[PDB]
């Protein structure tokens, strides 16, 4: 058998990708937001020395 | 979803080290900077330079890690996989006669 | 997304803040996951009837 006609394959999609999303969102609120808030004040600079 | 287990693992699980850099950064070069606020202007001329030099060295030392992570991330974008097969059968009685 | 941490080692003077690229890489990694969209595919190879 060959030259099979147009099949009707069905896929549910949407694998377990949203699970890992909770990891980055949880680690940011614990160390990203505080760092961004602390950096807003007394912003340092860099020169030639 | 069970097929993307190793992919998601090598993508995110091993990538925790990337986010971990922010932890040490906020713990060292942020919370220990209170001495600069309570320092006189006579000392700020050198404190700022010392902080900048200390931060530049850390950035240069951690830069190769970013490149290594970027290069390893490409490993999860390789189009490779096996195949799947199926089967099917059916029966149907025709005729019968005693003996 | 065709980015995944731009990297590109660059250094200047009077315009490079020390604490700046750290949060940038984190934001890039966080945005890369949002653009991710799996795309599978299947095609007929061969068959038979016995």
Q: Can you offer a commentary on this structure?
A:
- The termini of chain A are far apart.
- The first copy, chain A, is elongated.
- The first copy, chain A, has one helix spanning 18-40.
- Chain A has 49 residues and is mainly alpha-helical.
- Chain A is built from 1 helix and no strands.
- Chains A and C meet through α1 of A and α1 of C.
- Chain C: Interacts with the host pilus.
- Chain C: This is Maturation protein A.
Topology:
The structure is cut from a larger assembly and holds three copies of chain A.
Chain A: H1 18-40
- Helix fraction of chain A, binned, reads 40-55%
- Beta percentage of chain A is under 5%
Name the chain pair with the biggest interface and residue counts per chain.
A-C, 23 and 21 residues
Structural class of chain A: mainly alpha
- Which oligomeric state applies? part of a larger assembly
Gross geometry of chain A: elongated
Question: How far apart are the termini of chain A?
Answer: 77 Å
Number of strands of chain A: 0
The major pleated sheet of chain A works out as: none
SS summary, helix count of chain A: 1
N-to-C SSE string of chain A, H for helix and E for strand? H
Q: What is the alpha-carbon Rg of chain A in Å?
A: 25 Å
PDB class: membrane protein
Keywords: Type IV pilus, T4P, PAO1, membrane protein
Entry title: Type IV pilus from Pseudomonas PAO1 strain with PP7 Maturation protein
Chains A, B, C: Maturation protein A
């Amino acid at each position: 058998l060959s030259t099979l006609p147009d099949p009707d394959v069905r896929f549910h999609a949407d694998v377990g990708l949203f699970e890992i999303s909770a990891g980055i969102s949880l680690l940011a609120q614990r160390y990203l937001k505080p760092l961004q808030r602390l950096l807003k004040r007394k912003s340092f600079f860099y020169g030639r020395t | 979803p069970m097929l993307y287990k190793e992919r998601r693992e090598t993508l995110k699980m091993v990538g925790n080290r990337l986010g971990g850099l922010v932890r040490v950064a906020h713990a060292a070069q942020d919370r220990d900077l209170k001495r600069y606020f309570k320092a006189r202007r006579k000392d700020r001329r050198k404190v700022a330079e010392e902080v900048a030099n200390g931060h530049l060295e850390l950035i240069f030392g951690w830069l190769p890690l970013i490149g290594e992570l970027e290069g390893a991330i490409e490993y999860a974008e390789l189009p490779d996989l096996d195949f799947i097969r199926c089967h099917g059968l059916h029966t149907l009685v025709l005729q019968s006669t005693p003996w | 997304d065709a980015r995944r941490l731009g990297f590109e080692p660059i250094s200047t003077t009077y315009d490079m803040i020390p604490l700046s690229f750290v949060v940038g890489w984190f934001s890039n990694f966080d945005k890369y996951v949002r653009t991710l969209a799996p795309l599978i595919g299947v095609t007929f190879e061969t068959g038979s009837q016995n």
